[PDB]
Amino acid sequence: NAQELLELDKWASLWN
């Protein structure tokens, strides 16, 4: 869902 997708994108953008 939208909430889960936002968390995914958020943290993926901070990856090594």
């Epitope: 994108d9 958020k10 943290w11 993926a12 953008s13 901070l14 990856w15 090594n16």
Partner: antibody, heavy 111, light 115 residues
Framework: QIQLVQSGPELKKPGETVKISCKAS????????VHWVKQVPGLKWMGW????????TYADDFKGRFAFSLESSASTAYLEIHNLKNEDTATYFC??????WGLGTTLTVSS | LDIQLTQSPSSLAMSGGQKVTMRCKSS????????????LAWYQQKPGQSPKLLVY???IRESGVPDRFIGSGSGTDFTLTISSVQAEDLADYFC?????????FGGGTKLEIKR
């Protein structure tokens, strides 16, 4: 929950080395990059370190005298500046990418 | 080529309760086609303090940040609005693009009291 704790103010003479620590908590240290930013009373991006491999990447203006390192088991990132010059006087921040900034460490270079 | 960010105005003299608007223009689109997020964040910084995240992915307010703060825009043009500005909002504000390295910061907007 997320915290970045930096070491205290530093006073250094020209030509010296300073080592600034950034101790991370509240998340998996090795999953996300740590960035370093310089601020003189605007902001300048210095580069980042890969917290999994330890590989540093430096911005063009920070290529010779600057070193990023890790003590991964302590969830700590380090910034070293060698051959200190008067222009290095500033506040240095570590950051968990764009998400969270450390409180900063001030550095004064003076004879 | 390095992404340039132009922030305006560099200074703004405010009155409590007014709508405050500041803008960030990038030299290249900050929109990631793979996830449709814009890689721009806005921060508040008070004297002798560290930057605090206000808005991320251009338009998403950070949790805990008062609802008077609003980000908008897409591609190359972004804005931060403070809908009813408060004395406690006196601070510097700046944008950050984290689309590509080197990351780049806008020159900042300094809010002051008008008199």
């Amino acid at each position: 929950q997320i915290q970045l704790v930096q070491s205290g103010p530093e006073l250094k003479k020209p030509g010296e080395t300073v080592k600034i620590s950034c101790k991370a908590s509240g998340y998996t240290f090795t999953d996300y990059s740590v960035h370093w930013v310089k601020q003189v009373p605007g902001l300048k991006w210095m580069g980042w370190i890969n917290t999994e491999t330890g590989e540093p990447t430096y911005a063009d203006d920070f290529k010779g005298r600057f070193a990023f390192s890790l003590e991964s088991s302590a969830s700590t990132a380090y910034l070293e500046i060698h051959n200190l010059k008067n222009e290095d006087t500033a506040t240095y921040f570590c950051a968990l990418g764009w998400l969270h900034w450390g409180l900063g460490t001030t550095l004064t270079v003076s004879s | 080529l390095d992404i340039q960010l132009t922030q305006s105005p560099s200074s703004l003299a405010m009155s409590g309760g007014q709508k405050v608007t500041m803008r960030c223009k990038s030299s290249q689109s900050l929109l990631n086609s793979r996830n449709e997020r814009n890689y721009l964040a806005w921060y508040q910084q008070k004297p002798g303090q560290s930057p605090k995240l206000l808005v991320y992915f251009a338009s998403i307010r950070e949790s805990g940040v008062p609802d008077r703060f609003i980000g908008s825009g897409s591609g190359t043009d972004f804005t931060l609005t403070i809908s009813s500005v408060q004395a406690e909002d006196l601070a510097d504000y700046f944008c950050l693009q984290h689309y590509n390295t080197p990351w780049t910061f806008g020159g900042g907007t300094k809010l002051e009291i008008k008199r």
